[PDB]
């Protein structure tokens, strides 16, 4: 699994469950093409978005739908969504974990990249 | 000054100087329209992007050009840029500070909204 | 002002006001000795903890009383306090800003060291 | 495993390997008693510090030896060590993951607490 997402909730000290995630790739015409989507599990993890074959070199945008998440917990947060944009696989295939740590008015995001 | 940007460097423990910042406003057709831009000062701050009159309610995107920043320092970064997307509200506090704390493979961003 | 503290609230998107801060210096016998204290202002800042004369090289601990802060807001926090432990150096930049960004179950802390 | 530690390096986008961790408990006389210690693995994780029997209620301090870590990578960091202090097990046994994300002049720490 070459692209995975893991989301934590910094208010509750828990995984952020059921968080929608949309992934896009930059096409040759410079538009954002839909690439994959899913939702975090009870563990706050999202796997199986793509395969090593389909996850070719390119610029990817991982949108994490944080506003929707917070509004279901009765919180009106600042951001619409967290937006993680990066070049992938430009030095050959890698595995990527995109982590995000959520607070109503702040988030952080970290990438862990490994060589298979 | 209703919208300010402040950028820190977590490797050097310093303001992030000369970071390009581009602000966009979401148009009716859901496209991103250029709104304001600048470069952070010696103090890592960017002031005077807009005015109270022009900064109406709506969805904005603040793009922080982190890749170029790390490149100029000879450090290989992960992200193309940092993206901060939010709704500007008239109800709440009047002044928005978008703060960002940069590391090569991680960043955080915080909104400080005050009267 | 060689040592400043700035605290933000990541839940409210605001300065963290009235947060108690205790600074300690490591004594020769490796114990922590009270050095300075205060409470953050309306702007989440604490200035005037020490002077250039008194702030000699050594190991310092800045204790930020985060539990009491969350308690006063009726929110259950994880940490007893935030702890920032560092060596003050004469070689590098002269002014230390210890920044902290608080959430109930997480915090970050950053050192901004400037001339 | 009721107490685990996971450390990431925000410069490299990798687990922080071989990071020393010392855990202390507050004794009835208000001193910090040594409780456990270890080092993060190749995955940046540290398990097996304690058992559910020995991990009783109390105030614990998890010291993560960050300065030593950075100095081996040629970096002179700001902090001596990250110091995570918390009450544990005061509402019955819980599992704790203490995460830390390291940069030379900044770190964050997050707790994920679950009910077994």
From Swiss-Prot, chains A, D:
* UniProt-reported outcome of changing residue 27 to P: In AMYLD1; amyloid polyneuropathy
The answer to whether the entry has keyword Translocase is: no
Can you tell me which residues are glycosylated? 89
Q: How is it modified after translation?
A: Not glycosylated under normal conditions. Following unfolding, caused for example by variant AMYLD1 'Gly-38', the cryptic Asn-89 site is exposed and glycosylated by STT3B-containing OST complex, leading to its degradation by the ER-associated degradation (ERAD) pathway.
Q: Which residues carry this modification: Phosphoserine?
A: 43
Phenotype for residue 80 to K: In AMYLD1; amyloid polyneuropathy
Give the recorded effect for residue 21 to M: In AMYLD1; amyloid polyneuropathy; by far the most frequent mutation
Q: What does this protein do?
A: Thyroid hormone-binding protein. Probably transports thyroxine from the bloodstream to the brain.
How is this protein named in the record? Transthyretin
**Covered residues of the complete protein?**
30 to 145 of 147
